[PDB]
């Protein structure tokens, strides 16, 4: 009697959930801002 | 021994007592799929 390698049931569908209608982060606009800070006063922006 | 006789307590009445004893002769037959335990469903883990 041979115990064969364990199988897992293959998924029959894919569930993808995202929050809709979220605005664009505009990361490029803040990175391309021409008022660039020095490392002494490095600037932070939080994208969420 | 008073003379040639010793003092002994000899039963004059009796009953029958029952005592249980469990002796383990078997244990659960644990089987491990080492591949499924170590790596679950992951091809990258099964390769390694
Ligand atoms: C033995 O003991 C039982 C219960 O203690 C009693 O009913 C019985 O009469 C006794 N027998 C004798 C011979 O002492």
Your description of this structure?
It is classed as viral protein. The structure is cut from a larger assembly and holds 2 copies of chain A (48 residues). Chain A has 48 residues and is low in regular secondary structure. Helix content of chain A is 10%, strand content 0%. Chain A has one helix at 27-31. Chain A binds chain B through residues 3, 5-6, 8, and chain B through 31, 33, 35-36, 40-41. Bound molecules: 2-acetamido-2-deoxy-beta-D-glucopyranose (NAG).
Defining traits:
part of a larger assembly; 2 chains; 48 residues; 0% strand; binds 2-acetamido-2-deoxy-beta-D-glucopyranose; Spike protein S1 (chain A); viral protein; HCoV-HKU1 spike glycoprotein ectodomain; proline stablized; Spike glycoprotein
Can you summarize this structure?
Chain A: This is Spike protein S1. With 48 residues, chain A is largely without helices or strands.
List the helices and strands and how they pair.
The structure is cut from a larger assembly and holds 2 copies of chain A (48 residues).
Chain A: H1 27-31
